[PDB]
Scaffold this active site. Sequence first.
Site, PDB file in Angstrom:
ATOM      1  N   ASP A 128     -62.473  25.447 -12.157  1.00 13.92           N
ATOM      2  CA  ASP A 128     -62.323  24.832 -13.467  1.00 13.92           C
ATOM      3  C   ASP A 128     -63.532  23.965 -13.807  1.00 13.92           C
ATOM      4  O   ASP A 128     -63.618  22.820 -13.359  1.00 13.92           O
ATOM      5  CB  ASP A 128     -61.053  23.981 -13.470  1.00 13.92           C
ATOM      6  CG  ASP A 128     -60.796  23.296 -14.800  1.00 13.92           C
ATOM      7  OD1 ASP A 128     -61.461  23.658 -15.790  1.00 13.92           O
ATOM      8  OD2 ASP A 128     -59.905  22.407 -14.850  1.00 13.92           O
ATOM      9  N   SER A 161     -73.968  25.072 -29.438  1.00 15.40           N
ATOM     10  CA  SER A 161     -74.241  26.426 -29.902  1.00 15.40           C
ATOM     11  C   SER A 161     -74.964  26.358 -31.234  1.00 15.40           C
ATOM     12  O   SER A 161     -74.750  25.444 -32.025  1.00 15.40           O
ATOM     13  CB  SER A 161     -72.930  27.197 -30.048  1.00 15.40           C
ATOM     14  OG  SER A 161     -73.119  28.457 -30.656  1.00 15.40           O
TER      15      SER A 161
END
Length: 330
Positions: free
Chosen positions: A35, A199
């Site tokens: 994770d 992004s």
Amino acid sequence: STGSATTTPIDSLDDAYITPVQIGTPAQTLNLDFDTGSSDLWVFSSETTASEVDGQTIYTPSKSTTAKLLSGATWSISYGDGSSSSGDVYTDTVSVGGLTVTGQAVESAKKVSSSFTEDSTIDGLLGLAFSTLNTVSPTQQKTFFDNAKASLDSPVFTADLGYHAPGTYNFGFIDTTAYTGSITYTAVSTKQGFWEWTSTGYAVGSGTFKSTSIDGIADTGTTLLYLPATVVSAYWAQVSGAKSSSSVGGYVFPCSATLPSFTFGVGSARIVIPGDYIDFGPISTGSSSCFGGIQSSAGIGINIFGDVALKAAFVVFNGATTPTLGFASK
Ligand SMILES: Cc1ccccc1N
């Protein structure tokens, strides 16, 4: 040193991925959920409330000659999906794919919430976010990656998740045969303890690319792709009959649909998520309404590049002095 381990979807939907991990002496092998959105290595154990164990493999520290109680230490964590666990702490030898750390904090669960109990395939979590998020008190503990880092050939790990198929976690090296083209690296902020990056934009299907900054985290422990409501609405508007359902808890679409791809930007590079990756199947057994793999982050407070996005790429988690993230197509 290096390590290399195969990671395998837990079910036919790629709801999560499990990777075998050796703990203790002799080895006890548990299947852990790696994770990158948390920083605790915790396991189902001989100390876990019996009624909260249902099919998981447990760690039994009393059977490990290298286990030592970390006296006074406790831990307690709660995740974005509302699940939680807590307990006490041992140190022991932990190996992943041939890479060994001695003295790793292994957090033994005394209590786990229902969603953990109900998932027989996940024996615990191995956190790979930054150690500043580790919940052990009163002495915060380091992640497996942070403990291994100095010994690694290169201070990196990579995630190569499969679509409806196994993939690989590598530690200490970049497998140049595992991706196409070049790896594009992008800046990371560690201020919130996550692999947080920005992004450069998105496209829906064959549509034009929209240049826009989208801050978010690279999170292997989240199933879906969570993005701003504007972006998500633009995606689902291209699917006939798709709608946001308050009763179901997100966007659903007709199971008869063929979904468009979704592209996200990494610098000047582009990662394309095929439409099929965005199909999470019937909302309930036998239903013709299907659950979408791209959902709104509104109300989460952060955008999350979860497995839906990450499995379309070869992803480098670069833990150099200034961390960065790399993405390649594959
Ligand atoms: C890693 C994470 C952070 C914040 C909210 C949700 C998640 N999953």
